[PDB]
């Protein structure tokens, strides 16, 4: 999809296979915020958000964080606290026709700057003088849109890159999108190493009475660390008391 | 040779449906906007519809609203009008005319230098 | 809408006299009018561009001037040929609205 109006899908209840991905050499920029890609493999999310558009080489530095410039502030913005993967790669080969491909937009005049995750498909005739524009084209009238060119013989500044953007809403919630690692059997009442939905630590794991309410998932002591889990596979809640330690 | 040849004119019932091509020769077509103008005999000019250079916008006087279409085939450098609900006020000759060549923050005040030879269109029983 | 106002409808004058004639605005259009000759049963030509930019071919004696929502296309020394009926037309915007168009007639 054209960048002003680019594509978003919602990835939920699926375990997430990122291997392929930073494995694959096609892409040509991979780059991640807020979480590091070896790390990403062990590790679940409530929500996975996958937005999708075209752009040019010269405008894939502002896919990022805290940028500036067309496509940054009228067609695509991500907030500063952003947590998730940019992935662009180059597709010359598929995006440009011999006459130049002129199917990919972008937004070039808003009278404000895009919101963070701000998707703004209006084709209202831009006025950019004192005489108000009646929607008709025309002097000090914009429209909007502006075409990309997309020609095979074009600079790579100019070429096509494809841009996927992978948001990441690792707020404490229950987990839908867990990576590809196998689970093992739940030992009670017994100092472990535990790892549930990706928080990890060291503690016995036992049995409560806390009646978690259907959308939490963890909680948490006055010192901010986890209090109690539930298992992910059967809806159970575990205390987690920190192995036995004193002075010596 | 720079010009604009057009076609389709005849005669039409009430009712029917027409359609006028207007093909363009001696210029880069895509870079202009172009216009549909119409003159009834004995009477003045008519502005009738315009299409953007690519057709992102679309203009239509509010006499033919809802009954005509205006479009381009950049590739094949031509420009059509196809005329549905057609009546007898809309027999007329009419001519495709090539604006000017939008570019950055300039409304282009070289345009309407080259019109069609017109095409004639009479709606009757 | 932007509305065009020509006058005078119709005039009469001589070989060499000075026509005159004008184009008025409901609103302003910059200087985006333009000038057109038509012979009876003929393709409209251009004249003047730009309200007052002369199109290539167009005889010196023809002018265009005017800005806004007054402008004034002259004939400084009307000849033979020169009958026929001129329009303007706005182009400020997507709406290329003509006049109601200036016959001019020759008295010999």
């Known amino acids: 999809a054209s960048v002003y109006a680019w594509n978003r899908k919602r990835i939920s209840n699926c375990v997430a296979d990122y291997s392929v991905l930073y494995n694959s050499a096609s892409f040509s920029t991979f780059k991640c915020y807020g979480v590091s890609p070896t790390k990403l493999n062990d590790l679940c999310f409530t929500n996975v958000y996958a937005d999708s558009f075209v752009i040019r080489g010269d405008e894939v530095r502002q896919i990022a964080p805290g940028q500036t410039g067309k496509i940054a502030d009228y067609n695509y913005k991500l907030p500063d606290d952003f947590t998730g993967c940019v992935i662009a790669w180059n597709s010359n080969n598929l995006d440009s026709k011999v006459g130049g491909n002129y199917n990919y937009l972008y937004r070039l005049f808003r009278k404000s700057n895009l919101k963070p995750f701000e998707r703004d498909i209006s084709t209202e005739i831009y006025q950019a003088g004192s005489t108000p524009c009646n929607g008709v084209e025309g002097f000090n009238c914009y429209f909007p849109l502006q075409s990309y060119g997309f020609q095979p013989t074009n600079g790579v500044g100019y070429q096509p890159y494809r841009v996927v953007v992978l948001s990441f809403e690792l707020l404490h919630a229950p987990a839908t999108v867990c990576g590809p690692k196998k689970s093992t059997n739940l030992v009670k009442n017994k100092c472990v190493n535990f790892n549930f939905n990706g928080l990890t630590g060291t503690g016995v794991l036992t049995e409560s009475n806390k009646k978690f309410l259907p959308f939490q998932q963890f909680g948490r002591d006055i010192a901010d660390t986890t209090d109690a889990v539930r298992d992910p596979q059967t809806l159970e809640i575990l205390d987690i008391t920190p192995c036995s330690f004193g002075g010596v | 040779e720079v010009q604009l040849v057009e076609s389709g004119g005849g005669l039409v019932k009430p009712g029917e449906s027409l359609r006028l091509s207007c093909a363009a020769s001696?210029?880069?077509?895509?870079?202009?906007?172009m216009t549909w103008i119409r003159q009834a005999p004995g009477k003045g000019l008519e502005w009738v519809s315009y299409?953007?250079?690519?057709?992102?916008?679309?203009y239509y006087a509010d006499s033919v609203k809802g009954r005509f279409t205006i479009s381009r085939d950049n590739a094949k450098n031509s420009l059509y009008l196809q005329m549905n609900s057609l009546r007898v006020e809309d027999t007329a000759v009419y001519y495709c005319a090539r604006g000017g060549v939008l570019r950055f923050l300039e409304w282009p005040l070289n345009a309407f230098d080259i019109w069609g030879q017109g095409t004639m269109v009479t709606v009757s029983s | 809408d932007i509305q065009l106002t020509q006058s005078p409808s119709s005039l009469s004058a001589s070989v060499g006299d000075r026509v005159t004639i004008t184009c008025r605005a409901s609103?302003?259009?910059?200087?985006?009018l333009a000038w057109y000759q038509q012979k009876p049963g003929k393709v409209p030509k251009l004249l003047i561009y730009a309200a007052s930019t002369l199109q290539s071919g167009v005889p010196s004696r023809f002018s265009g001037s005017g800005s806004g929502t007054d402008f004034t296309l002259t004939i400084s020394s009307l000849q033979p040929e020169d009958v026929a009926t001129y329009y303007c037309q706005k182009y400020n915007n997507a709406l290329g609205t003509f006049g109601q168009g200036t016959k001019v007639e020759i008295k010999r």
């Open positions: 299409i953007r250079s690519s057709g992102h916008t679309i």
């Open positions: 001696g210029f880069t077509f895509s870079d202009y906007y």
């Open positions: 609103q302003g259009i910059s200087n985006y």
